[PDB]
């Protein structure tokens, strides 16, 4: 829409109040013109036709409970855009300031969210397994990192490349959650998963086995379900990334942590310069070693930590 940029206020899914960038032209729309070619949030109105209607609002105050998922999707896409711009000097997901589009209220009782190749889509959850999925900043950043991958390495979504694809999204979703300093942790989806239970989450990067996911290459899933285990075998890579960052001893192998910032620089470089559509775990290890080598020298501690971490999860 063509209009005047302004700022509205509303409440997100967890009840927190925030300012959001809107556009005024008869109605106030969820269109943020301050970032690249714009961030646009749509109402799918409980249907599965996409994108639905650009979200329109009469007075620029988004406190209705129907508005909550739209507020957070809108807001957390802006935070993710800022993270990639400020930290990695990347303008939007294609590197050219492509418009970011999200639809909320997709379908009825839908317990998921996803990047479909052209935009983000968020279900509201059934209210028991999940509440509206855009309330989780690590979920929004996970899904938006899928767009980044698609334009760079292009990892195919099955078997080991798909598991790498998923782990990359859990890693940057987590790094965006630490960047926004929203109660950060190494768990995925804990703000929106099972509103009745405290403490749990969909997956854990610091201890994947807590939920039954593999934390070592000898425990990888080899069947056919979940596209060859793309959400399951990503635990091996997540555990490796957690160790590079934080350090620790795993199956008897000791890793000195080098921190989150270097973790993000190494994986972002590996992703945009060395991974290809069919890379598998052993090529990820080589990409990450080469990236850390490029940035810190082949005899740095950084290179040494990336090798110990992949040795600790059994990836050679
Ligand atoms: Ca309103
Ligand atoms: Ca958290
Ligand atoms: Ca989290
Ligand atoms: Ca829970
Ligand atoms: Zn994913």
Swiss-Prot record:
GO cellular component annotations of the record: extracellular region
Can you tell me which residues bind Ca(2+) 4?
Answer: 193-194, 197, 200
Tell which residues of the whole protein are contained here: 233 to 548 of 548
- Protein name listed in UniProt: Thermolysin
Positions bound to Zn(2+): 142, 146, 166
For activity, the cofactor(s) needed are:
Ca(2+); Zn(2+)
Positions that bind Ca(2+) 3:
177, 183, 185, 190
What are the catalytic residues?
Answer: 143, 231 (proton donor)
Query: What family does the entry list?
Result: Belongs to the peptidase M4 family.
Annotated keywords: Calcium, Hydrolase, Metal-binding, Metalloprotease, Protease, Secreted, Signal, Zinc, Zymogen
Detail the relationship between temperature and activity: Thermostable.
- Where would you say this protein principally sits, based on its record? secreted
Please state where this protein is localized: Secreted
Q: Would you say which domain of life the source belongs to?
A: Bacteria
Q: Which residues bind Ca(2+) 1?
A: 57, 59, 61
| Chain positions recorded as Ca(2+) 2 binding sites | 138, 177, 185, 187, 190
In the record, biological process GO terms are:
proteolysis
UniProt remark on cofactor binding: Binds 4 Ca(2+) ions per subunit.
Say if the entry is tagged with keyword Calcium.
yes
Catalytic activity reads: Preferential cleavage: Xaa-|-Leu > Xaa-|-Phe
One GO MF term on file is: metalloendopeptidase activity
Q: What does this protein do?
A: Extracellular zinc metalloprotease.
Instruction: State its Enzyme Commission number(s).
Output: 3.4.24.27
């Amino acid at each position: 829409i063509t209009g005047t940029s302004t700022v509205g206020v509303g409440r997100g899914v967890l009840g927190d109040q925030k300012n959001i960038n809107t556009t005024y032209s008869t109605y106030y729309y969820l269109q943020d013109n301050t970032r690249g070619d714009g961030i646009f949030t749509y109402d799918a109105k409980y249907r599965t036709t996409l994108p639905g209607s650009l979200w329109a609002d009469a007075d620029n105050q988004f406190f209705a409970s129907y508005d909550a998922p739209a507020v957070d999707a809108h807001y957390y896409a802006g935070v993710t855009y800022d993270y990639y711009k400020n930290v990695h000097n990347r303008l939007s997901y294609d590197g050219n300031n492509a418009a970011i589009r999200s639809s909320v209220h997709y379908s009825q009782g839908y317990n998921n969210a996803f990047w479909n190749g052209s935009e983000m889509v968020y279900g509201d959850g059934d209210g028991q397994t999940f509440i509206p999925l855009s309330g989780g900043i690590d979920v929004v950043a996970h899904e938006l990192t899928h767009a980044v991958t698609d334009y760079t390495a292009g990892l195919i979504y099955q078997n080991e490349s798909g598991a790498i694809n998923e782990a990359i999204s859990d890693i940057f979703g987590t790094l965006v959650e630490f960047y926004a300093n929203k109660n950060p942790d190494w768990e995925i989806g804990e703000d929106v998963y099972t509103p009745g239970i405290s403490g749990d989450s969909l997956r854990s990067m610091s201890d994947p086995a807590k939920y039954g996911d593999p934390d070592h290459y000898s425990k990888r899933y080899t069947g056919t379900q979940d596209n060859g285990g793309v959400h399951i075998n990503s635990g091996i890579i997540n555990k490796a990334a957690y160790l590079i960052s934080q350090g620790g001893t795993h199956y008897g192998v000791s890793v000195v942590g080098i921190g989150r910032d270097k973790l993000g620089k190494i994986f972002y470089r590996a992703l945009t310069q060395y991974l290809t559509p069919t890379s598998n775990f052993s090529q990820l290890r080589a990409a990450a070693v080469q990236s850390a080598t490029d940035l810190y020298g082949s005899t740095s501690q950084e290179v040494a930590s990336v090798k110990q971490a992949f040795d600790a999860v059994g990836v050679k």
